[PDB]
Design an enzyme around this catalytic site. Structure first.
Site, PDB file in Angstrom:
ATOM      1  N   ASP A  37     -11.771 -16.311  -7.695  1.00 10.41           N
ATOM      2  CA  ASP A  37     -12.753 -14.958  -7.471  1.00 10.41           C
ATOM      3  C   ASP A  37     -13.169 -14.688  -9.010  1.00 10.41           C
ATOM      4  OD1 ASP A  37     -13.780 -12.700  -5.918  1.00 10.41           O
ATOM      5  OD2 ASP A  37     -12.489 -11.539  -7.279  1.00 10.41           O
ATOM      6  N   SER A  57      -3.156   0.640   0.397  1.00 10.49           N
ATOM      7  CA  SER A  57      -3.231  -0.893   1.029  1.00 10.49           C
ATOM      8  C   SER A  57      -1.650  -1.529   1.077  1.00 10.49           C
ATOM      9  CB  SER A  57      -4.047  -1.749  -0.145  1.00 10.49           C
ATOM     10  OG  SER A  57      -3.321  -1.644  -1.286  1.00 10.49           O
ATOM     11  N   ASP A 117      -2.066   3.337  -3.209  1.00  7.35           N
ATOM     12  CA  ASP A 117      -3.557   3.694  -2.649  1.00  7.35           C
ATOM     13  C   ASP A 117      -3.719   3.510  -0.944  1.00  7.35           C
ATOM     14  OD1 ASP A 117      -3.669   1.018  -2.317  1.00  7.35           O
ATOM     15  OD2 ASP A 117      -5.422   0.638  -3.357  1.00  7.35           O
ATOM     16  N   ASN A 155      -3.105  -8.717  -1.124  1.00  9.37           N
ATOM     17  CA  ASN A 155      -3.521  -7.129  -0.891  1.00  9.37           C
ATOM     18  C   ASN A 155      -4.617  -6.951   0.363  1.00  9.37           C
ATOM     19  OD1 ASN A 155      -3.953  -4.640  -3.358  1.00  9.37           O
ATOM     20  ND2 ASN A 155      -4.017  -4.327  -0.913  1.00  9.37           N
ATOM     21  N   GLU A 180       6.479 -12.352  -7.121  1.00 13.08           N
ATOM     22  CA  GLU A 180       5.750 -11.565  -6.056  1.00 13.08           C
ATOM     23  C   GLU A 180       6.830 -11.350  -4.917  1.00 13.08           C
ATOM     24  OE1 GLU A 180       3.321  -9.784  -6.686  1.00 13.08           O
ATOM     25  OE2 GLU A 180       2.000 -10.979  -8.131  1.00 13.08           O
ATOM     26  N   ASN A 199       1.127  -0.295  -1.377  1.00  7.32           N
ATOM     27  CA  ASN A 199       0.562   0.130  -2.769  1.00  7.32           C
ATOM     28  C   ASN A 199       0.358   1.858  -2.614  1.00  7.32           C
ATOM     29  OD1 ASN A 199       0.480  -2.425  -3.805  1.00  7.32           O
ATOM     30  ND2 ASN A 199      -1.149  -2.857  -2.372  1.00  7.32           N
ATOM     31  N   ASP A 218       0.651  -5.267   0.449  1.00  7.73           N
ATOM     32  CA  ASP A 218       0.688  -6.580  -0.106  1.00  7.73           C
ATOM     33  C   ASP A 218       1.452  -7.444   0.907  1.00  7.73           C
ATOM     34  OD1 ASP A 218      -0.891  -5.762  -2.299  1.00  7.73           O
ATOM     35  OD2 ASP A 218       0.903  -6.032  -3.747  1.00  7.73           O
TER      36      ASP A 218
END
Ligand SMILES: [Cl-]
Ligand SMILES: [Cl-]
Ligand SMILES: [Cl-]
Ligand SMILES: [Cl-]
Ligand SMILES: [Cl-]
Ligand SMILES: [Cl-]
Ligand SMILES: [Cl-]
Ligand code: NA
EC number: 3.2.1.17
Length: 129
Positions: A101, A50, A48, A59, A35, A46, A52
């Site tokens: 999650d 967003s 979209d 995110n 990562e 990202n 990280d």
């Protein structure tokens, strides 16, 4: 901060990540390697809009607030900047919520694509833990 491999393994164990939700420490070290290359200050935008953040590339779409991700949540109740600290506490606490999650470490696409199923114990090999 750029961690060394065993230095990060040690810090992750000190903050309770080793075998958290059944994921051995080498899983967590492998996820961090791919990562962030062990760099706490890593940020990546990202497609979209967003972003990280940090050693585990958490995110802004769901987990932290950066003020520029419309329609996003902040489920870790932290500014995304907290995930860039030399001290990994905020990243670890948030990663514990993500891995709880429902899809385990598959939430980290680099873990699914580069660590899942591999000899992840190599990542802690030789470390005094
Ligand atoms: Cl390494
Ligand atoms: Cl391991
Ligand atoms: Cl936002
Ligand atoms: Cl929220
Ligand atoms: Cl905030
Ligand atoms: Cl730390
Ligand atoms: Cl799982
Ligand atoms: Na957010």
């Amino acid at each position: 901060k750029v961690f060394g491999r065993c230095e990060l393994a040690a810090a992750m164990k000190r903050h309770g990540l080793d075998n958290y939700r059944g994921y051995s420490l080498g899983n967590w070290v492998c996820a961090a390697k791919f990562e962030s290359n062990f760099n706490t200050q890593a940020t990546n935008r990202n497609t979209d809009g967003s972003t990280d953040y940090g050693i585990l590339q958490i995110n802004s779409r769901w987990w932290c607030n950066d003020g520029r991700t419309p329609g996003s949540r902040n489920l870790c109740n932290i500014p995304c900047s907290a995930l860039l600290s030399s001290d990994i506490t905020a990243s670890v606490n948030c990663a514990k919520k993500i891995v709880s999650d429902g899809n385990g470490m598959n939430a980290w696409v680099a873990w699914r694509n580069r660590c899942k199923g591999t000899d992840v114990q190599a990542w802690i090999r030789g470390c005094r833990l």
